[model samples]
Target: ATGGYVQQATGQASFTMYSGCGSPACGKAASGFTAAINQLAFGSAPGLGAGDACGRCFALTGNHDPYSPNYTGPFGQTIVVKVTDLCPVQGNQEFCGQTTSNPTDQHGMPFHFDICEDTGGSAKFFPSGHGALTGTFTEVSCSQWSGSDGGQLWNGACLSGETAPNWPSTACGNKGTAPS
Candidate 1:
C-alpha cells in the first residue's frame, strides 16, 4: 500500500517526458523510460510513508492535437509508465510547475508526470516531436504492464525515498488499482 495510490486520485494531467531514472524512487542505473510523479500527489519523500507513490503503474492515454503548429497529424496513443521518481518544481520547467496549495499546475493539470524518455518519446510514443500533452491517467497494477518486474526496479524489492527507510518496499504480488 505504501508504494501504491495515496487517495485513488485519477484525472486529466499534463503528460510530459524526461530522460532517465531519477534519484527519488528508481535508481539511475535503469535504462528505460520510467516516470516521475509530481511531489504533491506523491507526498514528500525520504520518509517511507504510505502516501508515497513509488513503483506504482499508470496507464496514460491521450489523443493530442498536432505537436505544434509546424507538425501535422494528431498524436493519439496510450502509454503505461511506472512512478519511479518524484518530479520537483524546477525554476525553468514550466511543465512541472511550483504550487502545491492547489493540486493543479499552471497548466491547470491536477498532476504533472515528466515521463522518462530513454528510448524515445516524441519520435516514438507521442510521435512527430517533443512537447506536452493533455493525458488521461489512472493507476493500474505494475504487474499488469507487459514490462513489469514484479513492480520492483532493477535491484530493489520496492522503491523508497532518496533518504527514507528502505526496508518497507511494496510486495511483488499486490496488484490492483485505486479502490475508489
Candidate 2:
C-alpha cells in the first residue's frame, strides 16, 4: 500500500492550528507526541502519541475566494508545517482521523494537519482568524529544509523518532522525496 498521503497530489487540504505536541518526537523532537509515547529512547521522555503520520512536512498555499469574509487571501499565500501530533478520528466529524481509503474531511479535503499554532505557520497563515481553512498542499521533506519553517528547530523537530513504526523510510517516512 501507499505510505499514507503518498498517493495524493497537490490538492486541497485543511489545516487547524493547535498547541502542544501529539506526535511530538517527530515534530517536537524528544519530548513530543502525547503522554504515553514520551519515552526518551523508545522508553523515555513524558508526552504525546507517535502515529505513523508524524514528521511529515507539507507546504500549503491558500486559494480561497477573496470575497469570503471568514478568510483573508491574496490567493497565493503559502505556509509550511510539520506533522507533530496525531489527531485521531473524532466522532464529531473533525478533520483528523481520516484514512487513506477515504481520506476526506467534512470539508472534502484529502488530509488535515494538526499543526502547532505557535511553532508552526498557523499564526502567519491565519493572520486574523482562528479555524480550519483550505489550501493546496504538497508533501515536502523536512530533511531538505533550510530554516524558514515558521520557527522550526531542525534536528529536534520532524525527525524519524516521531514515527510510530512501520513507515516507508527514515524521518519523513517512506514516500520517497518528491518536489523540493
Candidate 3:
C-alpha cells in the first residue's frame, strides 16, 4: 500500500538552507530526525493538512527553463526528499503566491522544500545556486537508508548508486532522465 503512488501535486517550488531542523513553530526543531539536507517542508494549504506531510517522502523534479535561465542542477533527475518540517503560512508569499483573501496568509505549494546544503539539497539541483524553482512533486515512500547518515550530498534516489526498498528497482537500475 505504501509503494504505488499515494498522490501527485504540482506547483511552484523553492528552497531554504537553514540551521534549524524543519518545524515552523518559531522555536521548534527542524526535523524529527537528524537535520539532513534531503528534507522537505509542507505548507499550510487546503491540499496539505497541518503536519500531514511530516515524515512523508516525495519525488521532486524541477524545470530549469521555466524556473531559472541559469539553472543547472539535475533537470531530468527525480530528487527524492523526506518531509521534516512545515512552511509558515506567511513565509513564502512571493514564491508560492500570496493570498488575496488574507494578506498575511500564504501557502506552500504547490510545494516548498527547505533544502540543506549540508546534505547537498541546494547545490545538486540549482547550478546558479539556491532560489525559487518550478517543479512537480509526487508522494512516494522512503525506505531505510543504509549509507552514511547525512554524511554528504546525494542526488536521484537516496544517494548515488544506493537503493531504497520503497523506491522502484527500475529507478535505481537506470540513470539519466527521471522516472515517472
Taken over the whole model, the C-alpha lDDT of each candidate is 0.53, 0.44, 0.38
Candidate 2 residue-wise lDDT, 1-180, digit = tens: 223343342457666666754334444432221211101111111233233344445566655532264555544346655444444454566455355455566666655555555444555566554355666776565543333322344444444533223334443433322111
TM-score of 2: 0.58
- The best-first sequence of candidates by TM-score reads 1, 2, 3
Q: Predict model 3's lDDT versus the native.
A: 0.38
What tens-digit string does per-residue lDDT give for candidate 1 at 80-115?
Answer: 666666676556665555353444666677677777
Residue-level lDDT tens digits of model 3 in 73-167: 55534566555444444443454232323221123443456554445555555545435455566545455311123322222112221223332
Clashing pairs in 1: none
Q: Model 2 scores what on Cα lDDT?
A: 0.44
**Model 1 spans with C-alpha error above 4 angstroms:** 1-7, 22-33, 45-51, 65-73, 119-124, 148-157, 160-180
Q: Which ten residues in a row have the lowest lDDT in candidate 2?
A: 35-44
Rank the candidate models, highest lDDT first.
1, 2, 3
**Maximum-lDDT candidate:** 1
